[PDB]
Amino acid sequence: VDPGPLDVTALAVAAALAAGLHSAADDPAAALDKCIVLDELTEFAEKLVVHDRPGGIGTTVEYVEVYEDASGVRLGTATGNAVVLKMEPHMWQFHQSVSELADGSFEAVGVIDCTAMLRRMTQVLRVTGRSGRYAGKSGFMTLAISDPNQRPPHYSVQVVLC
Amino acid sequence: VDPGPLDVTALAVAAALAAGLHSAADDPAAALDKCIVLDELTEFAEKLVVHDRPGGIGTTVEYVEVYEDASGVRLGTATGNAVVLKMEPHMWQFHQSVSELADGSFEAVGVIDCTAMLRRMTQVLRVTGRSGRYAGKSGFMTLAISDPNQRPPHYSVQVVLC
């Protein structure tokens, strides 16, 4: 049960590569300054609405999550749905959210393995800018459970868009 | 060291969701019939050109992979690159590939924890059609390693495209 995290630079390069810049793998440093980086965020459920389904598969969750920086001051919210695709022996979900910050907003899509996140694996979603500073940009977001014993769960988050 | 897996129906729903309808969330049979499904695929390298960089980070890989069915007959090839992002404690890579079958072609992009794949975890990429029947469709593909000790590795693969 070993964490395997991903740092911002690494995530920034992947965002830059997926974006189209092959300059990225060569020059790690050059990626970041061009890219939009959000580090040291925590995300947690402010409100969850579960629509269960027999045995879990199809179960839908509408959520509103809050982004806190390193002081515990809100930076934005994420709003969206999660659908349960599998239960056993790993729980899997589909996620789609729109995150609104001061600067603007972006969208997040992905397929998360919850079970793996609880064994401290980092998970990834695709990010796409929607408005403001983020418009036209695209990226990735990493999700990591700080401590699996704590409920409600809290997540460490990074987002890079290029 | 425990999986992990994600079945094809569950995958088709994720594909259908991201693609479009929320009908997919509930009624899965609908997704499956509407969408394109490649199952029972085995993938391995026909050739690998590694361009190392000191310490691993930025090690670029160029590859031609081959898709076999359950009869060990080729269905297509995947031609791509991989860029190492992090080595420790987990190895991560960015992958981007064009895959060519008879029917058409599609692209695949994502960020794989290689290490977790050796704990027999399923990894997921985002897929997009490019040619032929696949054109204009979208989805996901999964990867898992059959035997972590087996060398070179063989990956079990599914692709669903909606």
Side-chain angles (χ1 to χ4, degrees), chain B residues 8-21 23-25 28-30:
Chain B
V8 245
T9 98
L11 199 65
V13 178
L17 288 168
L21 76 187
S23 148

PDB file of all heavy atoms in Angstrom, chain B residues 8-30, unseen atoms left out:
ATOM      1  N   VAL B   8     -16.294  -4.472 -19.686  1.00  0.00           N
ATOM      2  CA  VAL B   8     -16.493  -3.748 -20.917  1.00  0.00           C
ATOM      3  C   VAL B   8     -17.759  -2.958 -20.915  1.00  0.00           C
ATOM      4  O   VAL B   8     -17.778  -1.823 -21.409  1.00  0.00           O
ATOM      5  CB  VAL B   8     -16.521  -4.648 -22.153  1.00  0.00           C
ATOM      6  CG1 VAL B   8     -15.347  -4.291 -23.001  1.00  0.00           C
ATOM      7  CG2 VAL B   8     -16.552  -6.143 -21.765  1.00  0.00           C
ATOM      8  N   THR B   9     -18.830  -3.565 -20.411  1.00  0.00           N
ATOM      9  CA  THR B   9     -20.053  -2.790 -20.252  1.00  0.00           C
ATOM     10  C   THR B   9     -19.754  -1.528 -19.414  1.00  0.00           C
ATOM     11  O   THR B   9     -19.941  -0.422 -19.909  1.00  0.00           O
ATOM     12  CB  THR B   9     -21.280  -3.622 -19.707  1.00  0.00           C
ATOM     13  OG1 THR B   9     -21.447  -3.452 -18.295  1.00  0.00           O
ATOM     14  CG2 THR B   9     -21.139  -5.099 -20.065  1.00  0.00           C
ATOM     15  N   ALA B  10     -19.258  -1.682 -18.187  1.00  0.00           N
ATOM     16  CA  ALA B  10     -18.893  -0.533 -17.360  1.00  0.00           C
ATOM     17  C   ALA B  10     -18.096   0.545 -18.132  1.00  0.00           C
ATOM     18  O   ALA B  10     -18.318   1.748 -17.943  1.00  0.00           O
ATOM     19  CB  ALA B  10     -18.122  -0.995 -16.141  1.00  0.00           C
ATOM     20  N   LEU B  11     -17.181   0.101 -18.998  1.00  0.00           N
ATOM     21  CA  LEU B  11     -16.381   0.996 -19.805  1.00  0.00           C
ATOM     22  C   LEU B  11     -17.249   1.697 -20.837  1.00  0.00           C
ATOM     23  O   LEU B  11     -17.087   2.866 -21.086  1.00  0.00           O
ATOM     24  CB  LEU B  11     -15.244   0.207 -20.502  1.00  0.00           C
ATOM     25  CG  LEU B  11     -14.063   1.019 -21.009  1.00  0.00           C
ATOM     26  CD1 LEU B  11     -13.291   1.660 -19.865  1.00  0.00           C
ATOM     27  CD2 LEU B  11     -13.112   0.169 -21.859  1.00  0.00           C
ATOM     28  N   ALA B  12     -18.158   0.967 -21.470  1.00  0.00           N
ATOM     29  CA  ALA B  12     -19.009   1.549 -22.517  1.00  0.00           C
ATOM     30  C   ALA B  12     -19.849   2.688 -21.983  1.00  0.00           C
ATOM     31  O   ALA B  12     -20.062   3.687 -22.662  1.00  0.00           O
ATOM     32  CB  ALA B  12     -19.876   0.486 -23.136  1.00  0.00           C
ATOM     33  N   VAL B  13     -20.291   2.538 -20.736  1.00  0.00           N
ATOM     34  CA  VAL B  13     -21.070   3.559 -20.052  1.00  0.00           C
ATOM     35  C   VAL B  13     -20.242   4.812 -19.822  1.00  0.00           C
ATOM     36  O   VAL B  13     -20.690   5.919 -20.058  1.00  0.00           O
ATOM     37  CB  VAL B  13     -21.562   3.026 -18.685  1.00  0.00           C
ATOM     38  CG1 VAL B  13     -22.326   4.077 -17.948  1.00  0.00           C
ATOM     39  CG2 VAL B  13     -22.379   1.759 -18.879  1.00  0.00           C
ATOM     40  N   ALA B  14     -19.016   4.644 -19.350  1.00  0.00           N
ATOM     41  CA  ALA B  14     -18.113   5.775 -19.185  1.00  0.00           C
ATOM     42  C   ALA B  14     -17.905   6.451 -20.523  1.00  0.00           C
ATOM     43  O   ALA B  14     -18.007   7.682 -20.669  1.00  0.00           O
ATOM     44  CB  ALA B  14     -16.871   5.312 -18.660  1.00  0.00           C
ATOM     45  N   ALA B  15     -17.695   5.641 -21.532  1.00  0.00           N
ATOM     46  CA  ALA B  15     -17.580   6.217 -22.852  1.00  0.00           C
ATOM     47  C   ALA B  15     -18.874   6.955 -23.222  1.00  0.00           C
ATOM     48  O   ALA B  15     -18.819   8.082 -23.723  1.00  0.00           O
ATOM     49  CB  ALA B  15     -17.206   5.152 -23.900  1.00  0.00           C
ATOM     50  N   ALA B  16     -20.030   6.351 -22.948  1.00  0.00           N
ATOM     51  CA  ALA B  16     -21.278   6.925 -23.441  1.00  0.00           C
ATOM     52  C   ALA B  16     -21.526   8.235 -22.694  1.00  0.00           C
ATOM     53  O   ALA B  16     -21.818   9.276 -23.292  1.00  0.00           O
ATOM     54  CB  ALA B  16     -22.382   5.964 -23.257  1.00  0.00           C
ATOM     55  N   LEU B  17     -21.338   8.182 -21.381  1.00  0.00           N
ATOM     56  CA  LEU B  17     -21.427   9.357 -20.550  1.00  0.00           C
ATOM     57  C   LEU B  17     -20.570  10.481 -21.100  1.00  0.00           C
ATOM     58  O   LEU B  17     -21.124  11.451 -21.629  1.00  0.00           O
ATOM     59  CB  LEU B  17     -21.088   9.020 -19.089  1.00  0.00           C
ATOM     60  CG  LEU B  17     -22.196   8.210 -18.384  1.00  0.00           C
ATOM     61  CD1 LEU B  17     -21.725   7.648 -17.059  1.00  0.00           C
ATOM     62  CD2 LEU B  17     -23.430   9.064 -18.181  1.00  0.00           C
ATOM     63  N   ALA B  18     -19.268  10.321 -21.149  1.00  0.00           N
ATOM     64  CA  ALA B  18     -18.432  11.422 -21.590  1.00  0.00           C
ATOM     65  C   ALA B  18     -18.824  11.850 -22.978  1.00  0.00           C
ATOM     66  O   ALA B  18     -18.791  13.024 -23.302  1.00  0.00           O
ATOM     67  CB  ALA B  18     -16.982  11.024 -21.576  1.00  0.00           C
ATOM     68  N   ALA B  19     -19.161  10.893 -23.816  1.00  0.00           N
ATOM     69  CA  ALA B  19     -19.603  11.225 -25.152  1.00  0.00           C
ATOM     70  C   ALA B  19     -20.884  12.014 -25.138  1.00  0.00           C
ATOM     71  O   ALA B  19     -21.015  12.994 -25.857  1.00  0.00           O
ATOM     72  CB  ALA B  19     -19.804   9.967 -25.967  1.00  0.00           C
ATOM     73  N   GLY B  20     -21.845  11.580 -24.334  1.00  0.00           N
ATOM     74  CA  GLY B  20     -23.148  12.193 -24.404  1.00  0.00           C
ATOM     75  C   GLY B  20     -24.168  11.858 -23.352  1.00  0.00           C
ATOM     76  O   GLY B  20     -24.188  12.401 -22.259  1.00  0.00           O
ATOM     77  N   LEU B  21     -25.040  10.942 -23.719  1.00  0.00           N
ATOM     78  CA  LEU B  21     -26.262  10.729 -22.991  1.00  0.00           C
ATOM     79  C   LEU B  21     -26.021  10.288 -21.565  1.00  0.00           C
ATOM     80  O   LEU B  21     -25.062   9.589 -21.277  1.00  0.00           O
ATOM     81  CB  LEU B  21     -27.151   9.717 -23.712  1.00  0.00           C
ATOM     82  CG  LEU B  21     -26.737   8.257 -23.595  1.00  0.00           C
ATOM     83  CD1 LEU B  21     -27.579   7.366 -24.493  1.00  0.00           C
ATOM     84  CD2 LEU B  21     -25.269   8.096 -23.907  1.00  0.00           C
ATOM     85  N   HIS B  22     -26.890  10.765 -20.676  1.00  0.00           N
ATOM     86  CA  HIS B  22     -26.971  10.306 -19.300  1.00  0.00           C
ATOM     87  C   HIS B  22     -27.892   9.103 -19.194  1.00  0.00           C
ATOM     88  O   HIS B  22     -28.013   8.504 -18.139  1.00  0.00           O
ATOM     89  CB  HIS B  22     -27.459  11.429 -18.396  1.00  0.00           C
ATOM     90  N   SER B  23     -28.512   8.735 -20.308  1.00  0.00           N
ATOM     91  CA  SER B  23     -29.271   7.496 -20.396  1.00  0.00           C
ATOM     92  C   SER B  23     -28.314   6.369 -20.075  1.00  0.00           C
ATOM     93  O   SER B  23     -28.694   5.357 -19.496  1.00  0.00           O
ATOM     94  CB  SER B  23     -29.853   7.310 -21.808  1.00  0.00           C
ATOM     95  OG  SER B  23     -29.948   5.951 -22.185  1.00  0.00           O
ATOM     96  N   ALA B  24     -27.062   6.562 -20.467  1.00  0.00           N
ATOM     97  CA  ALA B  24     -26.041   5.543 -20.360  1.00  0.00           C
ATOM     98  C   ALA B  24     -25.900   5.179 -18.920  1.00  0.00           C
ATOM     99  O   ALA B  24     -25.580   4.053 -18.594  1.00  0.00           O
ATOM    100  CB  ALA B  24     -24.710   6.037 -20.894  1.00  0.00           C
ATOM    101  N   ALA B  25     -26.117   6.140 -18.047  1.00  0.00           N
ATOM    102  CA  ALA B  25     -25.832   5.913 -16.652  1.00  0.00           C
ATOM    103  C   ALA B  25     -26.658   4.752 -16.175  1.00  0.00           C
ATOM    104  O   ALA B  25     -26.121   3.849 -15.548  1.00  0.00           O
ATOM    105  CB  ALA B  25     -26.164   7.156 -15.842  1.00  0.00           C
ATOM    106  N   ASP B  26     -27.943   4.740 -16.529  1.00  0.00           N
ATOM    107  CA  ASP B  26     -28.844   3.703 -16.077  1.00  0.00           C
ATOM    108  C   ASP B  26     -28.746   2.514 -17.007  1.00  0.00           C
ATOM    109  O   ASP B  26     -28.133   1.508 -16.663  1.00  0.00           O
ATOM    110  CB  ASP B  26     -30.278   4.224 -16.046  1.00  0.00           C
ATOM    111  N   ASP B  27     -29.326   2.649 -18.195  1.00  0.00           N
ATOM    112  CA  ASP B  27     -29.516   1.515 -19.099  1.00  0.00           C
ATOM    113  C   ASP B  27     -28.250   1.152 -19.909  1.00  0.00           C
ATOM    114  O   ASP B  27     -27.968   1.787 -20.935  1.00  0.00           O
ATOM    115  CB  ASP B  27     -30.666   1.829 -20.055  1.00  0.00           C
ATOM    116  N   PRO B  28     -27.497   0.115 -19.473  1.00  0.00           N
ATOM    117  CA  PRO B  28     -26.190  -0.103 -20.102  1.00  0.00           C
ATOM    118  C   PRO B  28     -26.269  -0.769 -21.477  1.00  0.00           C
ATOM    119  O   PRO B  28     -25.505  -0.400 -22.374  1.00  0.00           O
ATOM    120  CB  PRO B  28     -25.480  -1.049 -19.117  1.00  0.00           C
ATOM    121  CG  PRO B  28     -26.366  -1.135 -17.906  1.00  0.00           C
ATOM    122  CD  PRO B  28     -27.739  -0.900 -18.433  1.00  0.00           C
ATOM    123  N   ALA B  29     -27.172  -1.739 -21.616  1.00  0.00           N
ATOM    124  CA  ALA B  29     -27.355  -2.473 -22.860  1.00  0.00           C
ATOM    125  C   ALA B  29     -27.455  -1.492 -24.019  1.00  0.00           C
ATOM    126  O   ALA B  29     -26.909  -1.731 -25.091  1.00  0.00           O
ATOM    127  CB  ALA B  29     -28.614  -3.339 -22.774  1.00  0.00           C
ATOM    128  N   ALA B  30     -28.148  -0.381 -23.787  1.00  0.00           N
ATOM    129  CA  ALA B  30     -28.259   0.666 -24.791  1.00  0.00           C
ATOM    130  C   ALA B  30     -26.883   1.162 -25.207  1.00  0.00           C
ATOM    131  O   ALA B  30     -26.580   1.138 -26.394  1.00  0.00           O
ATOM    132  CB  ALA B  30     -29.105   1.817 -24.284  1.00  0.00           C
TER     133      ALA B  30
END
